[PDB]
PDB file of N, CA and C in Angstrom:
ATOM      1  N   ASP V1357       0.805  -1.224   0.000  1.00 14.85           N
ATOM      2  CA  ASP V1357       0.000   0.000   0.000  1.00 14.85           C
ATOM      3  C   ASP V1357       0.845   1.284   0.000  1.00 14.85           C
ATOM      4  N   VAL V1358       1.984   1.332   0.700  1.00 15.63           N
ATOM      5  CA  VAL V1358       2.890   2.481   0.565  1.00 15.63           C
ATOM      6  C   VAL V1358       3.613   2.462  -0.775  1.00 15.63           C
ATOM      7  N   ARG V1359       3.829   1.281  -1.364  1.00 15.74           N
ATOM      8  CA  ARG V1359       4.395   1.114  -2.714  1.00 15.74           C
ATOM      9  C   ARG V1359       3.458   1.676  -3.782  1.00 15.74           C
ATOM     10  N   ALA V1360       2.148   1.657  -3.543  1.00 14.52           N
ATOM     11  CA  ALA V1360       1.226   2.509  -4.280  1.00 14.52           C
ATOM     12  C   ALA V1360       1.372   3.968  -3.832  1.00 14.52           C
ATOM     13  N   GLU V1361       1.284   4.291  -2.538  1.00 14.52           N
ATOM     14  CA  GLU V1361       1.260   5.676  -2.035  1.00 14.52           C
ATOM     15  C   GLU V1361       2.429   6.541  -2.549  1.00 14.52           C
ATOM     16  N   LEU V1362       3.646   6.000  -2.479  1.00 15.01           N
ATOM     17  CA  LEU V1362       4.899   6.620  -2.916  1.00 15.01           C
ATOM     18  C   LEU V1362       4.951   6.897  -4.433  1.00 15.01           C
ATOM     19  N   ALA V1363       4.069   6.274  -5.214  1.00 14.36           N
ATOM     20  CA  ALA V1363       3.914   6.477  -6.647  1.00 14.36           C
ATOM     21  C   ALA V1363       2.500   6.962  -7.039  1.00 14.36           C
ATOM     22  N   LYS V1364       1.609   7.218  -6.071  1.00 13.46           N
ATOM     23  CA  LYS V1364       0.209   7.647  -6.293  1.00 13.46           C
ATOM     24  C   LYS V1364       0.092   9.094  -6.781  1.00 13.46           C
ATOM     25  N   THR V1365       1.142   9.858  -6.516  1.00 12.77           N
ATOM     26  CA  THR V1365       1.299  11.311  -6.615  1.00 12.77           C
ATOM     27  C   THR V1365       2.804  11.579  -6.609  1.00 12.77           C
ATOM     28  N   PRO V1366       3.274  12.792  -6.944  1.00 12.40           N
ATOM     29  CA  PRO V1366       4.579  13.213  -6.418  1.00 12.40           C
ATOM     30  C   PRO V1366       4.663  12.965  -4.921  1.00 12.40           C
ATOM     31  N   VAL V1367       5.798  12.468  -4.396  1.00 12.37           N
ATOM     32  CA  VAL V1367       5.910  11.900  -3.022  1.00 12.37           C
ATOM     33  C   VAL V1367       5.324  12.783  -1.902  1.00 12.37           C
ATOM     34  N   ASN V1368       4.485  12.182  -1.045  1.00 13.64           N
ATOM     35  CA  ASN V1368       3.543  12.884  -0.163  1.00 13.64           C
ATOM     36  C   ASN V1368       3.869  12.630   1.322  1.00 13.64           C
ATOM     37  N   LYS V1369       4.727  13.476   1.901  1.00 14.52           N
ATOM     38  CA  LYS V1369       5.558  13.120   3.068  1.00 14.52           C
ATOM     39  C   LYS V1369       4.780  12.759   4.341  1.00 14.52           C
ATOM     40  N   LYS V1370       3.937  13.653   4.870  1.00 13.47           N
ATOM     41  CA  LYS V1370       3.201  13.411   6.131  1.00 13.47           C
ATOM     42  C   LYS V1370       2.458  12.080   6.089  1.00 13.47           C
ATOM     43  N   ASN V1371       1.719  11.846   5.012  1.00 17.52           N
ATOM     44  CA  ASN V1371       0.961  10.624   4.814  1.00 17.52           C
ATOM     45  C   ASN V1371       1.870   9.393   4.675  1.00 17.52           C
ATOM     46  N   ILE V1372       2.961   9.461   3.909  1.00 18.61           N
ATOM     47  CA  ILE V1372       3.935   8.363   3.804  1.00 18.61           C
ATOM     48  C   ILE V1372       4.480   7.963   5.189  1.00 18.61           C
ATOM     49  N   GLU V1373       4.832   8.937   6.034  1.00 17.75           N
ATOM     50  CA  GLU V1373       5.232   8.635   7.414  1.00 17.75           C
ATOM     51  C   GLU V1373       4.067   8.115   8.276  1.00 17.75           C
ATOM     52  N   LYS V1374       2.827   8.588   8.101  1.00 18.36           N
ATOM     53  CA  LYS V1374       1.662   8.049   8.827  1.00 18.36           C
ATOM     54  C   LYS V1374       1.542   6.539   8.640  1.00 18.36           C
ATOM     55  N   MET V1375       1.857   6.054   7.442  1.00 19.65           N
ATOM     56  CA  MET V1375       1.875   4.619   7.156  1.00 19.65           C
ATOM     57  C   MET V1375       3.077   3.931   7.812  1.00 19.65           C
ATOM     58  N   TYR V1376       4.253   4.562   7.828  1.00 19.72           N
ATOM     59  CA  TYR V1376       5.357   4.038   8.626  1.00 19.72           C
ATOM     60  C   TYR V1376       4.986   3.965  10.110  1.00 19.72           C
ATOM     61  N   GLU V1377       4.295   4.968  10.645  1.00 23.58           N
ATOM     62  CA  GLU V1377       3.811   4.956  12.022  1.00 23.58           C
ATOM     63  C   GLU V1377       2.888   3.766  12.234  1.00 23.58           C
ATOM     64  N   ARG V1378       1.920   3.532  11.338  1.00 22.94           N
ATOM     65  CA  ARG V1378       1.089   2.322  11.396  1.00 22.94           C
ATOM     66  C   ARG V1378       1.962   1.064  11.468  1.00 22.94           C
ATOM     67  N   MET V1379       2.925   0.935  10.554  1.00 22.35           N
ATOM     68  CA  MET V1379       3.810  -0.222  10.479  1.00 22.35           C
ATOM     69  C   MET V1379       4.613  -0.408  11.765  1.00 22.35           C
ATOM     70  N   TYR V1380       5.304   0.627  12.216  1.00 21.92           N
ATOM     71  CA  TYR V1380       6.241   0.497  13.318  1.00 21.92           C
ATOM     72  C   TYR V1380       5.522   0.370  14.654  1.00 21.92           C
ATOM     73  N   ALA V1381       4.392   1.056  14.819  1.00 21.99           N
ATOM     74  CA  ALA V1381       3.545   0.871  15.984  1.00 21.99           C
ATOM     75  C   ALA V1381       3.050  -0.571  16.050  1.00 21.99           C
ATOM     76  N   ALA V1382       2.678  -1.143  14.904  1.00 22.70           N
ATOM     77  CA  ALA V1382       2.270  -2.533  14.850  1.00 22.70           C
ATOM     78  C   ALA V1382       3.441  -3.488  15.122  1.00 22.70           C
ATOM     79  N   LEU V1383       4.550  -3.330  14.398  1.00 19.94           N
ATOM     80  CA  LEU V1383       5.538  -4.385  14.147  1.00 19.94           C
ATOM     81  C   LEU V1383       7.001  -3.923  14.247  1.00 19.94           C
ATOM     82  N   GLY V1384       7.257  -2.692  14.685  1.00 16.53           N
ATOM     83  CA  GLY V1384       8.608  -2.177  14.917  1.00 16.53           C
ATOM     84  C   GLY V1384       9.010  -2.088  16.396  1.00 16.53           C
ATOM     85  N   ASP V1385       8.117  -1.625  17.280  1.00 16.97           N
ATOM     86  CA  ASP V1385       8.399  -1.458  18.713  1.00 16.97           C
ATOM     87  C   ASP V1385       8.258  -2.763  19.536  1.00 16.97           C
ATOM     88  N   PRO V1386       9.280  -3.223  20.281  1.00 17.29           N
ATOM     89  CA  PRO V1386       9.157  -4.403  21.154  1.00 17.29           C
ATOM     90  C   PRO V1386       8.360  -4.137  22.420  1.00 17.29           C
ATOM     91  N   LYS V1387       8.118  -2.874  22.763  1.00 19.29           N
ATOM     92  CA  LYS V1387       7.363  -2.520  23.964  1.00 19.29           C
ATOM     93  C   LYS V1387       5.881  -2.329  23.658  1.00 19.29           C
ATOM     94  N   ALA V1388       5.266  -3.345  23.059  1.00 20.68           N
ATOM     95  CA  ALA V1388       3.850  -3.296  22.734  1.00 20.68           C
ATOM     96  C   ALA V1388       3.009  -3.722  23.932  1.00 20.68           C
ATOM     97  N   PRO V1389       1.756  -3.255  24.009  1.00 22.14           N
ATOM     98  CA  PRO V1389       0.906  -3.616  25.151  1.00 22.14           C
ATOM     99  C   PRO V1389       0.652  -5.112  25.268  1.00 22.14           C
ATOM    100  N   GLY V1390       0.177  -5.730  24.192  1.00 24.05           N
ATOM    101  CA  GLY V1390      -0.160  -7.139  24.219  1.00 24.05           C
ATOM    102  C   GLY V1390       0.682  -7.986  23.288  1.00 24.05           C
ATOM    103  N   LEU V1391       1.995  -7.736  23.195  1.00 26.10           N
ATOM    104  CA  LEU V1391       2.892  -8.498  22.314  1.00 26.10           C
ATOM    105  C   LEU V1391       2.992  -9.968  22.723  1.00 26.10           C
ATOM    106  N   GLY V1392       2.911 -10.869  21.750  1.00 26.73           N
ATOM    107  CA  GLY V1392       3.172 -12.292  21.943  1.00 26.73           C
ATOM    108  C   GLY V1392       4.605 -12.693  21.642  1.00 26.73           C
ATOM    109  N   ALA V1393       5.084 -13.692  22.372  1.00 25.13           N
ATOM    110  CA  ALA V1393       6.463 -14.148  22.280  1.00 25.13           C
ATOM    111  C   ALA V1393       6.821 -14.666  20.886  1.00 25.13           C
ATOM    112  N   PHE V1394       5.873 -15.243  20.151  1.00 24.31           N
ATOM    113  CA  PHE V1394       6.142 -15.570  18.763  1.00 24.31           C
ATOM    114  C   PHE V1394       6.419 -14.314  17.939  1.00 24.31           C
ATOM    115  N   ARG V1395       5.513 -13.334  17.904  1.00 24.06           N
ATOM    116  CA  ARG V1395       5.708 -12.112  17.097  1.00 24.06           C
ATOM    117  C   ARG V1395       6.943 -11.311  17.509  1.00 24.06           C
ATOM    118  N   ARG V1396       7.300 -11.322  18.793  1.00 23.48           N
ATOM    119  CA  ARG V1396       8.520 -10.688  19.326  1.00 23.48           C
ATOM    120  C   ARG V1396       9.762 -11.101  18.547  1.00 23.48           C
ATOM    121  N   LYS V1397       9.820 -12.360  18.134  1.00 25.99           N
ATOM    122  CA  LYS V1397      10.860 -12.931  17.281  1.00 25.99           C
ATOM    123  C   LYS V1397      11.060 -12.123  16.013  1.00 25.99           C
ATOM    124  N   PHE V1398       9.983 -11.906  15.270  1.00 26.57           N
ATOM    125  CA  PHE V1398      10.020 -11.132  14.039  1.00 26.57           C
ATOM    126  C   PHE V1398      10.490  -9.705  14.311  1.00 26.57           C
ATOM    127  N   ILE V1399       9.996  -9.095  15.391  1.00 29.04           N
ATOM    128  CA  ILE V1399      10.369  -7.721  15.749  1.00 29.04           C
ATOM    129  C   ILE V1399      11.868  -7.641  16.005  1.00 29.04           C
ATOM    130  N   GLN V1400      12.416  -8.497  16.859  1.00 27.62           N
ATOM    131  CA  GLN V1400      13.854  -8.507  17.109  1.00 27.62           C
ATOM    132  C   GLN V1400      14.643  -8.742  15.827  1.00 27.62           C
ATOM    133  N   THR V1401      14.195  -9.674  14.996  1.00 29.33           N
ATOM    134  CA  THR V1401      14.929 -10.048  13.793  1.00 29.33           C
ATOM    135  C   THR V1401      14.826  -9.026  12.664  1.00 29.33           C
ATOM    136  N   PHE V1402      13.902  -8.060  12.689  1.00 26.84           N
ATOM    137  CA  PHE V1402      13.746  -7.119  11.570  1.00 26.84           C
ATOM    138  C   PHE V1402      13.490  -5.656  11.931  1.00 26.84           C
ATOM    139  N   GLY V1403      12.979  -5.346  13.120  1.00 28.16           N
ATOM    140  CA  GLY V1403      12.732  -3.967  13.559  1.00 28.16           C
ATOM    141  C   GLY V1403      13.987  -3.102  13.474  1.00 28.16           C
ATOM    142  N   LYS V1404      15.108  -3.692  13.885  1.00 28.01           N
ATOM    143  CA  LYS V1404      16.458  -3.178  13.677  1.00 28.01           C
ATOM    144  C   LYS V1404      16.682  -2.681  12.242  1.00 28.01           C
ATOM    145  N   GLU V1405      16.417  -3.547  11.273  1.00 28.06           N
ATOM    146  CA  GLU V1405      16.695  -3.306   9.871  1.00 28.06           C
ATOM    147  C   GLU V1405      15.700  -2.328   9.247  1.00 28.06           C
ATOM    148  N   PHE V1406      14.488  -2.223   9.788  1.00 27.76           N
ATOM    149  CA  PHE V1406      13.570  -1.149   9.413  1.00 27.76           C
ATOM    150  C   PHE V1406      14.141   0.213   9.793  1.00 27.76           C
ATOM    151  N   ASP V1407      14.911   0.282  10.878  1.00 26.55           N
ATOM    152  CA  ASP V1407      15.624   1.503  11.233  1.00 26.55           C
ATOM    153  C   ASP V1407      16.762   1.846  10.253  1.00 26.55           C
ATOM    154  N   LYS V1408      17.232   0.875   9.455  1.00 26.63           N
ATOM    155  CA  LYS V1408      18.447   0.983   8.630  1.00 26.63           C
ATOM    156  C   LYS V1408      18.170   1.099   7.139  1.00 26.63           C
ATOM    157  N   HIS V1409      17.272   0.280   6.597  1.00 29.47           N
ATOM    158  CA  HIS V1409      16.908   0.325   5.180  1.00 29.47           C
ATOM    159  C   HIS V1409      15.869   1.421   4.934  1.00 29.47           C
ATOM    160  N   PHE V1410      14.805   1.450   5.734  1.00 28.59           N
ATOM    161  CA  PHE V1410      14.091   2.700   6.011  1.00 28.59           C
ATOM    162  C   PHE V1410      14.847   3.456   7.111  1.00 28.59           C
ATOM    163  N   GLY V1411      14.355   4.623   7.509  1.00 31.09           N
ATOM    164  CA  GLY V1411      14.859   5.276   8.714  1.00 31.09           C
ATOM    165  C   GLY V1411      13.982   4.949   9.908  1.00 31.09           C
ATOM    166  N   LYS V1412      14.520   5.141  11.113  1.00 30.72           N
ATOM    167  CA  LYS V1412      13.714   5.440  12.305  1.00 30.72           C
ATOM    168  C   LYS V1412      12.786   6.618  11.971  1.00 30.72           C
ATOM    169  N   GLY V1413      11.499   6.529  12.302  1.00 27.73           N
ATOM    170  CA  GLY V1413      10.490   7.527  11.907  1.00 27.73           C
ATOM    171  C   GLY V1413      10.233   7.654  10.390  1.00 27.73           C
ATOM    172  N   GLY V1414      10.860   6.798   9.568  1.00 28.58           N
ATOM    173  CA  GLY V1414      10.654   6.716   8.121  1.00 28.58           C
ATOM    174  C   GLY V1414      11.546   7.628   7.273  1.00 28.58           C
ATOM    175  N   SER V1415      12.562   8.289   7.829  1.00 29.65           N
ATOM    176  CA  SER V1415      13.299   9.365   7.138  1.00 29.65           C
ATOM    177  C   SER V1415      13.834   8.989   5.747  1.00 29.65           C
ATOM    178  N   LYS V1416      14.470   7.820   5.607  1.00 32.82           N
ATOM    179  CA  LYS V1416      14.910   7.294   4.303  1.00 32.82           C
ATOM    180  C   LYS V1416      13.721   7.080   3.367  1.00 32.82           C
ATOM    181  N   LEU V1417      12.683   6.387   3.840  1.00 32.14           N
ATOM    182  CA  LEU V1417      11.457   6.097   3.090  1.00 32.14           C
ATOM    183  C   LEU V1417      10.725   7.369   2.621  1.00 32.14           C
ATOM    184  N   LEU V1418      10.843   8.461   3.371  1.00 27.03           N
ATOM    185  CA  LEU V1418      10.197   9.734   3.085  1.00 27.03           C
ATOM    186  C   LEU V1418      10.680  10.412   1.793  1.00 27.03           C
ATOM    187  N   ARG V1419      11.789   9.934   1.216  1.00 30.26           N
ATOM    188  CA  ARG V1419      12.485  10.512   0.050  1.00 30.26           C
ATOM    189  C   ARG V1419      12.948   9.476  -0.986  1.00 30.26           C
ATOM    190  N   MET V1420      13.265   8.263  -0.530  1.00 33.24           N
ATOM    191  CA  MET V1420      13.559   7.041  -1.290  1.00 33.24           C
ATOM    192  C   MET V1420      12.600   6.826  -2.471  1.00 33.24           C
ATOM    193  N   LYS V1421      13.083   6.291  -3.603  1.00 29.15           N
ATOM    194  CA  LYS V1421      12.251   6.173  -4.801  1.00 29.15           C
ATOM    195  C   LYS V1421      11.703   4.765  -4.934  1.00 29.15           C
ATOM    196  N   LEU V1422      10.588   4.603  -5.632  1.00 28.72           N
ATOM    197  CA  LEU V1422       9.864   3.340  -5.551  1.00 28.72           C
ATOM    198  C   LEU V1422      10.643   2.144  -6.105  1.00 28.72           C
ATOM    199  N   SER V1423      11.380   2.304  -7.193  1.00 30.39           N
ATOM    200  CA  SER V1423      12.212   1.220  -7.720  1.00 30.39           C
ATOM    201  C   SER V1423      13.200   0.672  -6.678  1.00 30.39           C
ATOM    202  N   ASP V1424      13.610   1.502  -5.714  1.00 28.39           N
ATOM    203  CA  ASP V1424      14.392   1.089  -4.557  1.00 28.39           C
ATOM    204  C   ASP V1424      13.499   0.442  -3.489  1.00 28.39           C
ATOM    205  N   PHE V1425      12.382   1.072  -3.108  1.00 28.20           N
ATOM    206  CA  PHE V1425      11.561   0.604  -1.998  1.00 28.20           C
ATOM    207  C   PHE V1425      10.954  -0.774  -2.270  1.00 28.20           C
ATOM    208  N   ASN V1426      10.447  -0.957  -3.488  1.00 29.98           N
ATOM    209  CA  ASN V1426       9.917  -2.204  -4.008  1.00 29.98           C
ATOM    210  C   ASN V1426      10.920  -3.335  -3.746  1.00 29.98           C
ATOM    211  N   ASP V1427      12.146  -3.236  -4.262  1.00 30.72           N
ATOM    212  CA  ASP V1427      13.150  -4.263  -4.012  1.00 30.72           C
ATOM    213  C   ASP V1427      13.680  -4.302  -2.580  1.00 30.72           C
ATOM    214  N   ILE V1428      13.702  -3.195  -1.839  1.00 33.81           N
ATOM    215  CA  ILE V1428      14.030  -3.233  -0.411  1.00 33.81           C
ATOM    216  C   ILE V1428      13.034  -4.131   0.321  1.00 33.81           C
ATOM    217  N   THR V1429      11.742  -3.905   0.123  1.00 33.49           N
ATOM    218  CA  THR V1429      10.730  -4.732   0.772  1.00 33.49           C
ATOM    219  C   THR V1429      10.644  -6.120   0.172  1.00 33.49           C
ATOM    220  N   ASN V1430      10.899  -6.299  -1.126  1.00 33.93           N
ATOM    221  CA  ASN V1430      11.042  -7.637  -1.685  1.00 33.93           C
ATOM    222  C   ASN V1430      12.162  -8.376  -0.975  1.00 33.93           C
ATOM    223  N   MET V1431      13.340  -7.776  -0.823  1.00 31.62           N
ATOM    224  CA  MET V1431      14.465  -8.385  -0.125  1.00 31.62           C
ATOM    225  C   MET V1431      14.091  -8.756   1.313  1.00 31.62           C
ATOM    226  N   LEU V1432      13.443  -7.847   2.040  1.00 34.02           N
ATOM    227  CA  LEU V1432      12.970  -8.121   3.391  1.00 34.02           C
ATOM    228  C   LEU V1432      12.049  -9.343   3.406  1.00 34.02           C
ATOM    229  N   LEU V1433      11.065  -9.393   2.514  1.00 36.00           N
ATOM    230  CA  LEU V1433      10.135 -10.514   2.440  1.00 36.00           C
ATOM    231  C   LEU V1433      10.775 -11.811   1.950  1.00 36.00           C
ATOM    232  N   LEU V1434      11.711 -11.741   1.012  1.00 35.06           N
ATOM    233  CA  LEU V1434      12.503 -12.872   0.535  1.00 35.06           C
ATOM    234  C   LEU V1434      13.303 -13.517   1.668  1.00 35.06           C
ATOM    235  N   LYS V1435      13.654 -12.769   2.723  1.00 33.60           N
ATOM    236  CA  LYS V1435      14.315 -13.322   3.909  1.00 33.60           C
ATOM    237  C   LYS V1435      13.375 -13.605   5.102  1.00 33.60           C
ATOM    238  N   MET V1436      12.267 -12.883   5.247  1.00 32.05           N
ATOM    239  CA  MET V1436      11.209 -13.203   6.219  1.00 32.05           C
ATOM    240  C   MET V1436      10.491 -14.509   5.860  1.00 32.05           C
ATOM    241  N   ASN V1437       9.981 -14.605   4.630  1.00 33.12           N
ATOM    242  CA  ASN V1437       9.183 -15.726   4.113  1.00 33.12           C
ATOM    243  C   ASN V1437      10.001 -16.994   3.849  1.00 33.12           C
ATOM    244  N   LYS V1438      11.320 -16.915   4.046  1.00 32.71           N
ATOM    245  CA  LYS V1438      12.291 -17.985   3.818  1.00 32.71           C
ATOM    246  C   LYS V1438      11.844 -19.256   4.544  1.00 32.71           C
ATOM    247  N   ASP V1439      11.659 -19.153   5.855  1.00 30.35           N
ATOM    248  CA  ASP V1439      10.825 -20.038   6.663  1.00 30.35           C
ATOM    249  C   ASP V1439      10.378 -19.318   7.942  1.00 30.35           C
ATOM    250  N   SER V1440       9.251 -19.749   8.507  1.00 34.45           N
ATOM    251  CA  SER V1440       8.665 -19.190   9.728  1.00 34.45           C
ATOM    252  C   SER V1440       7.556 -20.108  10.219  1.00 34.45           C
ATOM    253  N   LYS V1441       7.860 -20.989  11.178  1.00 33.18           N
ATOM    254  CA  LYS V1441       6.866 -21.927  11.703  1.00 33.18           C
ATOM    255  C   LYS V1441       5.774 -21.157  12.442  1.00 33.18           C
ATOM    256  N   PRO V1442       4.515 -21.221  12.002  1.00 33.66           N
ATOM    257  CA  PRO V1442       3.435 -20.530  12.684  1.00 33.66           C
ATOM    258  C   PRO V1442       3.236 -21.139  14.079  1.00 33.66           C
ATOM    259  N   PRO V1443       2.979 -20.323  15.112  1.00 33.24           N
ATOM    260  CA  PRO V1443       2.906 -20.785  16.487  1.00 33.24           C
ATOM    261  C   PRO V1443       1.775 -21.800  16.669  1.00 33.24           C
ATOM    262  N   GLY V1444       1.924 -22.689  17.641  1.00 34.15           N
ATOM    263  CA  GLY V1444       0.968 -23.759  17.848  1.00 34.15           C
ATOM    264  C   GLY V1444      -0.170 -23.447  18.819  1.00 34.15           C
ATOM    265  N   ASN V1445       0.026 -22.551  19.787  1.00 35.97           N
ATOM    266  CA  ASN V1445      -0.784 -22.557  21.006  1.00 35.97           C
ATOM    267  C   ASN V1445      -0.844 -21.169  21.621  1.00 35.97           C
ATOM    268  N   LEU V1446      -1.997 -20.710  22.094  1.00 36.63           N
ATOM    269  CA  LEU V1446      -2.212 -19.322  22.480  1.00 36.63           C
ATOM    270  C   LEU V1446      -1.156 -18.695  23.392  1.00 36.63           C
TER     271      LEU V1446
END
């Protein structure tokens, strides 16, 4: 959806970061209210790299071009989706 947003118009900063806020509030911060120990794994293994390939607060993503972002997130997913055993029990 940001891969559409970043190409929907000339790049639209406040809104592009609002989506990073959605993402990082969901899946970037380890200090979540009701975080599960399974999902914590993904956060530790990639929240770091969201700070690096994107910026903390989205700064790189706020200016980065879509041909880069597309393959940045493809690369992230190519290593996330590599394997990940879904949790068994609440």
